[PDB]
Design a protein around this ligand. Structure first.
Ligand SMILES: *[C@@H]1O[C@H](CO)[C@@H](O[C@@H]2O[C@H](CO)[C@@H](O)[C@H](O[C@@H]3O[C@H](CO)[C@@H](O)[C@H](O)[C@@H]3O)[C@H]2NC(C)=O)[C@H](O)[C@H]1NC(C)=O
Ligand SMILES: *[C@@H]1O[C@H](CO)[C@@H](O[C@@H]2O[C@H](CO)[C@@H](O)[C@H](O)[C@H]2NC(C)=O)[C@H](O)[C@H]1NC(C)=O
Ligand SMILES: *[C@@H]1O[C@H](CO)[C@@H](O[C@H]2O[C@H](CO)[C@@H](O)[C@H](O)[C@H]2NC(C)=O)[C@H](O)[C@H]1NC(C)=O
Ligand SMILES: *[C@@H]1O[C@H](CO)[C@@H](O[C@H]2O[C@H](CO)[C@@H](O)[C@H](O)[C@H]2NC(C)=O)[C@H](O)[C@H]1NC(C)=O
Ligand SMILES: CC(C)CCC[C@@H](C)[C@H]1CC[C@H]2[C@@H]3CC=C4C[C@@H](O)CC[C@]4(C)[C@H]3CC[C@]12C
Ligand SMILES: CC(C)CCC[C@@H](C)[C@H]1CC[C@H]2[C@@H]3CC=C4C[C@@H](O)CC[C@]4(C)[C@H]3CC[C@]12C
Ligand SMILES: CC(C)CCC[C@@H](C)[C@H]1CC[C@H]2[C@@H]3CC=C4C[C@@H](O)CC[C@]4(C)[C@H]3CC[C@]12C
Ligand SMILES: CC(=O)N[C@@H]1[C@@H](O)[C@H](O)[C@@H](CO)O[C@H]1O
Ligand SMILES: *[C@@H]1O[C@H](CO)[C@@H](O)[C@H](O)[C@H]1NC(C)=O
Ligand SMILES: *[C@@H]1O[C@H](CO)[C@@H](O)[C@H](O)[C@H]1NC(C)=O
Ligand SMILES: *[C@@H]1O[C@H](CO)[C@@H](O)[C@H](O)[C@H]1NC(C)=O
Ligand SMILES: *[C@@H]1O[C@H](CO)[C@@H](O)[C@H](O)[C@H]1NC(C)=O
Ligand SMILES: *[C@@H]1O[C@H](CO)[C@@H](O)[C@H](O)[C@H]1NC(C)=O
Ligand SMILES: *[C@@H]1O[C@H](CO)[C@@H](O)[C@H](O)[C@H]1NC(C)=O
Ligand SMILES: *[C@@H]1O[C@H](CO)[C@@H](O)[C@H](O)[C@H]1NC(C)=O
Ligand SMILES: *[C@@H]1O[C@H](CO)[C@@H](O)[C@H](O)[C@H]1NC(C)=O
Ligand SMILES: *[C@@H]1O[C@H](CO)[C@@H](O)[C@H](O)[C@H]1NC(C)=O
Lengths: 132, 1175
């Protein structure tokens, strides 16, 4: 579903949509030990040879780095090399592992190009839920 | 043996320093941080220390323990073992016995290039029973601003699944960001690898760590606290067979009487099938002669009577008026009054209060969701941000008022009371906006990020309703909520409408202006009342459609009564008008004698005014309620006498040779013994009821007695002459009732069958009255003394409906206690070594009961706080070494040392002259953010110091709050039980005599102390009044004890039926109800006397004949005179405006009148016909 997000400065790209699945209500509640799929519709404002996906999670006003399995968006539905002005939507999927707490938080997402300028930047608050 | 890994030279990042490796012997302490060794873990201090420890290691432990100290320091028993664990684990003297380093590497010195081998990792052998006893004994400590477990905040996860092994694992992991290096804990209970772990002694919640440190509370530990206390409620009703046990004793007695009665009558039907005369006779003749004299000397008589009226009523120049309620309702020498005199003298009077009960009707509750974790928290309507801003706006505006009195301006701050002044001078306002300090910025500012708030005003409110004495929220906001005046604001004092702990659910807002009350000073009180007046006007004119305000002021009750007192003189004037209207048409039957009825009204008013003026000379001040309730009564009696006299003349036919005076002397000589009996009986009744101890009833009783007497005298003297003059005068042209009574009423009433029924019915009604007697109320609502359209009524409704706290209580420990000795402190001491039956603990238990005792909260004793303050561990106190001056907790620390030496002996309480030595500094201590509350804002008032003679301590009090008190019964119960607690402590203290005693003081005690003896006061007062009536009656009527005893029995019946009607209309038995009854018992004679006199002085044949003859003759006069006139008066008074009149005077007078009418005109005829004295 298209989710509300706060743009933290998409300078090298234009977000067209952010589709997260499954997320019926927002902030979308993600039950522990369960995989979720992300779709990110964006319009690129620059040409970048490579693409590095960046994820930051903020708890209590403090950013936390979260490493993902894959650091490149071209093997996630992005055709490298990136050409200017083309519109591409990034598709991801990630599993929610156990042991994680049942919080609420803000996902921060950046996409740095060759010159290190974010092709898109959005932030979205999701709450870790239990069995439910 | 020896220690390893000594010092800390490496560094990982930030401040984390890896301990340097050193496997030599432990290097004794550098003698520098003896204090650290003492404060951190004194188990090592028995000096040869040889401790492997380092002062920089101690101070880095101390630095790391900051937040764990803040959370787990609540229950010392737990934080004690946790400290026992770190200190030993780090620099214990047998450190090699329970430790083995694993990872270490060279540490290059940037100072010398010399490699030191840092201790990166090692294993720590911990007993299984130690981690189990530690986590399980401290794991119950709850967190602040929530009812969760503090482990929920220290595990890094819910305190619900942090295993006892996992939390320590998390603590030792450098993955948190706090541990400078990770330590691998080893939970082995047996020596392994020749290495045995260590677990020093541990203490559970069922034990205190030190002989001065109390065990953990049951607030933070579940095992210490067992079954709550409960008192046994005894109803003590007899309830013979299911009902009141009086409904039955009476119904049974009545049936027995009715059976012996129709069992005598029916049986009778079946069977059928110088010693006395010497003192009265001279009275009739004397009175005739004096009446004849006065009829032939009208000028002199009238002149002397006017001279009398003026000489007595000219004293109205000295008329006082008493309006202070204490003077009105309290005897000058009552026990409670003496207690108030002692309390007002040593601690100053209790303060004033201007409340304000705000409410938001147009809003619904909303939910607050804590961002990190937790359950939903609902907030009441009034806790809306918009409503909070508007209420803050109202409060800040209420603060601006500076009413000007006597060309001087007094600000609200100037009149309010500031405990800690002139350091802090703002003033006491007890509102939930003080949690935010009455600042829109403090109320508005949020500590969150987009699409969420991290911390918020609701969150801030949540933390300090839990701990109202903090100096910072200390929870992601770090803003205090202690209050601008300095001193806690207890949440139960500022809110109402919530459910027993859920200040989230509060529905009303409480706000208070305490104002200083002054002892022997009137200009300041005048100034305060002028400010309160302006406060009321403002609040009255404030619109704010979003709010429903209930307000009150200290001087408002007096204003309501002075307001209502004056809006019904129009009632007494209309009453007089109707009395005169009736008198004009009823006085005899241009056949009208109106000139004389007006003369009678003026004589009556003359008697009233004369009574007021004489007593003003005497010095009795006016209550303005009496000046309003007195005239009706006096008018009733005076008119009653006038009609008797005038009508005997109207019905008199002139003999053979009497001009005018001869006839009038003959009539007055035959009528005066009766009128005199009625007047003397009433004067004595009133005066004797003027023996009770209450200045309002005392003074009223005197006034009315004197007025009635003067009225009788002036009336017999001035009016017989003027009646003679009118009688000459009325004739030159310049009965129907008697027919009825004789014709159809007397004969009918005296038939042989109607008479037994009447007697039976009346004895039955008396039986009922005696049955429902002990169900009469005691006390006054305190809400009915106000008009109906008053805002104080709404305020009382609001109080009863919302407030959760009541009037403050002060348990004053009288002068004479020691306070400077172990035992002298133990008898009062609310602590550890002091008795378990100590004053503070006894008050605590009483508050734990809470219903069998109406004392709601803990004492908040000052001596416990003083000791907490003086303890070396707190370290708040600090004196100069040479000047012996108090070093504040915020001070450069140049050379000032701790008050109490930091040794095992110095920890103990200050028993000698040091107690006093340090006490004044405590009372002078301010609220330091590093120290705490300090002892100046709360106890400066509570402690008295006497200069010289060893500087012995003065009288002190321990103030606790009452429970919400709604009814008079509730107030009396509270008084009783406070006295009970004080009595217990006084008895337990075992004084070698009665040199001193504890006693409780509350504001309403002076007004409610009479109801602890009102029953015996009423008994005595009624019995004596009835005995006086009896004696006067058995004397004046001659000596025929039979007639007198009959009259007394009839009046006693009248009183009992008065009590029955009391119970039936819900009138209460206070001192006003009691005065009116003692009066009615004296007004009843007015009825019962004429008939009995007409019976006694009769010479017919049979008892029946005498009774009927008396009925016709006198009752024709008595029914038109006394009954109808009183009835018209009361029906006019039935429309009151003060509630007190309309309830008590109106109902009591209607009852007294109609009861006396029925009794006289019916039960006396029959009872006399039956059992009258033969002759
Ligand atoms: C008086 O105050 C108490 C204090 O909480 C109120 O109780 C709470 O009521 C609210 C009302 O809606 C509930 O949300 C609170 O919580 C429950 O927690 C579960 C999860 O465990 C949630 O799924 C629920 O939706 C709910 O949020 C509840 N909590 C507690 C501890 O009582 C009470 O309502 C209030 N009085 C009134 C009349 O509301
Ligand atoms: C009441 O006491 C407080 C602190 O004891 C005083 O402090 C400030 O009040 C002013 C308003 O005059 C605010 O601007 C400040 O923000 C308050 N202090 C701080 C640090 O914020 C206050 O002056 C005293 N009197 C009144 C009327 O507030
Ligand atoms: C653990 O308890 C032991 C008890 O012996 C402590 O050992 C020392 O302290 C005792 C209390 O005074 C002394 O009686 C012992 O003699 C002394 N040890 C010696 C001299 O053998 C030990 O310090 C305690 N550890 C801690 C800090 O808990
Ligand atoms: C004592 O305080 C009040 C006294 O009324 C008790 O609260 C009441 O709750 C209901 C009325 O509000 C009724 O159930 C009772 O009047 C009373 N509750 C009881 C006693 O069942 C409160 O419970 C009492 N608390 C204690 C500690 O005795
Ligand atoms: C498309 C959606 C699912 C992206 C969000 C992925 C979620 C599951 C990721 C993003 C940030 C991650 C968090 C980053 C930081 C922490 C703090 C750590 O002490 C516990 C794990 C925890 C809480 C992580 C759990 C998993 C996490 C919440
Ligand atoms: C993040 C929260 C839960 C941590 C709470 C527990 C903290 C305060 C405890 C757990 C482990 C402790 C540390 C363990 C290691 C050392 C090195 C030692 O030579 C001095 C004490 C010191 C520096 C301790 C300081 C206090 C400490 C950090
Ligand atoms: C009625 C005639 C005889 C005059 C006597 C009037 C007196 C006793 C009445 C009129 C108003 C009454 C008062 C009404 C209000 C209060 C405030 C309460 O907190 C104490 C009782 C007190 C103070 C009452 C005492 C009795 C009272 C003062
Ligand atoms: C591979 C690479 O060039 N990475 C850099 C990163 O180190 C730097 O922090 C960032 C600026 O934000 O720019 C990019
Ligand atoms: C520790 O506390 C737990 C809590 O239930 C208890 O079961 C256990 O017996 C306790 N062990 C002790 C006090 O040694
Ligand atoms: C009330 O206070 C405000 C601000 O403190 C001030 O501007 C005003 O003059 C004061 N008096 C009023 C509003 O009558
Ligand atoms: C007090 O009265 C004088 C005149 O009697 C007047 O001039 C003065 O202004 C008054 N006080 C104030 C504060 O105005
Ligand atoms: C409350 O929190 C801080 C935390 O640093 C504490 O030191 C202090 O007592 C209060 N506020 C400030 C700003 O210090
Ligand atoms: C009541 O609250 C509303 C909230 O916007 C405000 O506009 C209004 O001025 C307040 N007072 C009223 C409506 O009397
Ligand atoms: C209380 O009174 C004394 C001192 O504590 C003692 O004789 C008695 O056993 C104590 N009992 C309790 C339960 O406190
Ligand atoms: C405290 O005073 C005593 C007595 O004058 C003196 O011996 C001692 O050195 C002083 N302490 C300090 C720290 O100056
Ligand atoms: C603390 O004590 C010092 C000592 O004189 C004083 O100057 C300062 O004002 C005090 N501060 C308080 C009591 O808040
Ligand atoms: C007063 O003391 C007696 C005897 O110690 C006790 O029975 C009674 O309960 C006490 N009163 C209370 C606790 O209200």
């Amino acid at each position: 579903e298209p989710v509300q997000f706060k743009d933290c400065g998409s300078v090298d790209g234009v977000i067209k949509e952010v589709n997260v699945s499954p997320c019926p209500t927002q902030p979308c509640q993600l039950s522990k030990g369960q995989s979720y799929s992300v779709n990110v519709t964006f319009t690129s404002n620059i040409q970048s040879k490579s693409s590095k996906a960046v994820v930051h999670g903020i708890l209590m006003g403090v950013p936390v780095p979260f490493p993902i399995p894959e650091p490149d968006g071209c093997k996630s539905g992005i055709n490298c090399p990136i050409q200017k002005d083309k519109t591409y939507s990034y598709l991801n999927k990630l599993p929610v592992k156990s042991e994680y707490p049942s919080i609420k938080l803000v996902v921060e997402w950046q996409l740095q190009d060759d010159k290190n300028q974010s092709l898109f930047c959005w932030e979205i608050p999701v709450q870790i839920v239990s069995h439910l | 043996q020896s220690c390893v890994w000594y010092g800390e030279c490496g560094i990982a990042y930030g401040d984390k320093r890896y301990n340097c490796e050193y496997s030599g012997p432990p290097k004794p302490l550098p003698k520098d941080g003896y204090d650290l060794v003492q404060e951190l873990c004194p188990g090592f201090f028995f000096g040869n220390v040889s401790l492997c420890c380092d002062v920089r290691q101690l101070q880095t432990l101390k630095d790391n323990l900051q937040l764990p100290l803040q959370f787990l320091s609540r229950c010392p028993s737990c934080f004690y073992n946790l400290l026992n664990l770190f200190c030993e684990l780090t620099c214990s003297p047998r450190q090699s016995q329970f430790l083995n380093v694993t990872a270490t590497e060279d540490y290059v010195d940037p100072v010398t290039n010399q490699t030191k081998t840092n201790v990166k990792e090692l294993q720590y052998y911990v007993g299984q029973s130690f981690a189990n006893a530690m986590y399980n004994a401290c794991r119950d400590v709850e967190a602040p601003s929530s009812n969760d477990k503090a482990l929920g905040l220290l595990c890094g996860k819910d305190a619900d699944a942090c295993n006892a092994t996992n939390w320590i694992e998390y603590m030792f992991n450098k993955d948190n960001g706090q541990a400078p290096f990770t330590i691998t804990p080893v939970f082995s209970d047996f020596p392994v690898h020749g290495m045995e772990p260590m677990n020093n002694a541990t203490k559970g919640c069922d034990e205190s760590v030190d002989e001065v440190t109390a065990p953990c509370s049951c607030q933070d530990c579940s095992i210490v606290c067992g079954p709550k206390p409960q008192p046994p409620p005894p109803p003590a009703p007899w309830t013979i067979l299911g009902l009141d046990a009086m409904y039955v004793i009476m119904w049974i007695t009545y049936m027995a009487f009715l059976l012996v009665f129709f069992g005598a009558f029916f049986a009778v039907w079946c069977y059928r099938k110088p010693v006395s005369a010497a003192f009265e006779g001279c009275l009739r003749r004397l009175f005739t002669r004096w009446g004849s004299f006065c009829v032939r000397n009208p000028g002199c008589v009238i002149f002397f009577s006017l001279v009398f009226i003026t000489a007595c009523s000219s004293g109205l120049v000295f008329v006082r008026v008493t309006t202070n309620p204490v003077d009105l309702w309290s005897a000058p020498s009552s026990q409670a009054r003496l207690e108030k005199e002692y309390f007002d003298q040593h601690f100053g009077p209790f303060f004033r209060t201007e409340q304000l009960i705000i409410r938001a009707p147009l809003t619904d509750k909303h939910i607050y969701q804590p961002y990190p974790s937790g359950a939903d928290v609902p907030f009441g309507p009034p806790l809306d941000i918009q409503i909070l801003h508007q209420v803050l706006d109202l409060q800040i505006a209420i603060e601006n008022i500076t009413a000007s009195y006597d060309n001087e301006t007094v600000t609200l701050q100037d009149i309010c009371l500031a405990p800690l002044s002139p350091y802090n001078t703002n003033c006491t306002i007890l509102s939930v906006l003080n949690y935010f300090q009455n600042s829109h910025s403090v109320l508005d500012h949020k500590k969150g990020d987009d699409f969420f708030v991290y911390a918020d005003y609701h969150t801030h409110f949540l933390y300090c309703v839990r701990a109202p004495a903090s100096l910072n929220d200390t929870s992601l906001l770090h803003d205090p909520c202690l209050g601008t005046f300095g001193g806690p604001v207890f949440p139960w004092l500022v809110l109402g409408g919530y459910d027993d702990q859920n200040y989230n659910n509060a529905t009303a807002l409480v706000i208070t202006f305490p104002v200083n009350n002054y002892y022997n000073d009137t200009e300041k009180l005048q100034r305060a009342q002028a400010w309160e007046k302006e406060f009321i006007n403002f609040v009255k004119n404030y619109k704010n459609p979003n709010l429903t305000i209930s307000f009150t002021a200290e001087r408002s009750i007096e204003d309501e009564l002075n307001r209502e007192s004056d809006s019904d003189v129009f009632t007494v004037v209309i009453s007089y008008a109707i009395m005169f209207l009736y008198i004009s048409l009823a006085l005899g039957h241009v056949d009208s004698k109106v000139s004389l009825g007006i003369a009678g009204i003026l004589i009556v008013l003359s008697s009233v005014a004369c009574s007021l003026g004489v007593f003003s000379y005497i010095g009795l001040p006016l209550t303005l309620i009496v000046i309003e309730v007195i005239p009706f009564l006096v008018l009733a009696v005076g008119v009653d006498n006038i009609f008797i006299l005038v009508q005997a003349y109207q019905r008199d036919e002139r003999l053979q040779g009497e001009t005018l005076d001869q006839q009038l002397g003959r009539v007055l000589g035959e009528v005066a013994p009766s009128m005199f009996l009625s007047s003397f009986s009433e004067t004595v009744a009133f005066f004797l009821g003027a023996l009770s101890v209450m200045p309002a009833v005392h003074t009223f009783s005197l006034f009315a007695g004197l007025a009635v007497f003067i009225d009788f005298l002036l009336q017999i003297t001035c009016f017989v002459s003027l009646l003679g003059l009118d009688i000459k005068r009325q004739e030159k042209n310049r009965s129907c009732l008697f027919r009825f009574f004789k014709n159809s009423y007397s004969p009918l009433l005296l038939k042989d069958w109607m008479r037994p029924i009447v007697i039976a019915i009346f004895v039955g009604v008396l039986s009922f009255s005696i049955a429902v007697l002990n169900k009469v109320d005691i006390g006054l609502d305190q809400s009915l003394s106000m008009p109906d359209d008053s805002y104080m009524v709404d305020y009382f409704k609001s109080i009863s409906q919302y407030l959760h706290a009541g009037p403050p209580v002060y348990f004053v420990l009288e002068e004479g206690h020691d306070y400077t000795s172990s035992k002298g402190q133990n008898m009062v001491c609310g602590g550890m070594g002091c008795n378990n039956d100590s004053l503070v603990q006894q008050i605590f238990n009483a508050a734990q009961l809470d219903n069998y005792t109406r004392i709601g909260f803990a004492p908040s004793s000052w001596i416990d706080d003083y000791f907490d303050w003086v303890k070396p561990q707190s370290s708040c106190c600090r004196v100069d070494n040479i000047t012996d001056q108090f070093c504040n907790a915020s001070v450069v620390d140049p050379a000032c040392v701790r008050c109490r030496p930091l040794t095992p002996e110095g920890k103990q309480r200050p028993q000698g002259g040091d107690f006093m030595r340090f006490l004044p500094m405590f009372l002078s201590d301010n609220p330091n953010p590093k120290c705490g509350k300090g002892g100046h804002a709360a106890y400066s008032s509570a402690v008295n110091i006497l200069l010289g003679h060893g500087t012995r301590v003065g009288a002190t009090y321990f103030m606790t709050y009452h429970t919400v008190l709604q009814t008079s019964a509730d107030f009396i119960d509270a008084l009783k039980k406070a006295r009970l607690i004080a009595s217990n402590v006084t008895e337990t203290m075992g004084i070698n005599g009665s040199a001193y005693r504890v006693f409780p003081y509350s504001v309403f005690y002076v007004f409610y102390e009479q109801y602890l003896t009102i029953i015996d006061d009423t008994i005595f007062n009624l019995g004596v009044s009835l005995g006086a009536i009896f004696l006067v009656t058995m004397v004046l009527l001659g000596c025929e004890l039979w007639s007198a005893v009959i009259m007394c029995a009839t009046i006693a019946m009248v009183l009992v039926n008065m009590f029955g009607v009391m119970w039936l209309w819900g009138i209460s038995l206070n001192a006003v109800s009691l005065v009116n009854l003692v009066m009615s018992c004296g007004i009843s004679v007015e009825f019962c006397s004429h008939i009995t006199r007409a019976f006694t002085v009769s010479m017919k044949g049979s008892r029946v004949e005498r009774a009927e003859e008396a009925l016709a003759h006198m009752g024709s006069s008595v029914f038109s005179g006394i009954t109808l006139t009183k009835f018209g008066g009361i029906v006019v008074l039935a429309f009151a405006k003060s509630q007190i009149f309309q309830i008590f005077y109106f109902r009591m007078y209607l009852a007294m009148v109609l009861l006396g009418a029925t009794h006289g005109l019916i039960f006396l005829p029959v009872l006399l016909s039956y059992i009258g004295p033969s002759v």
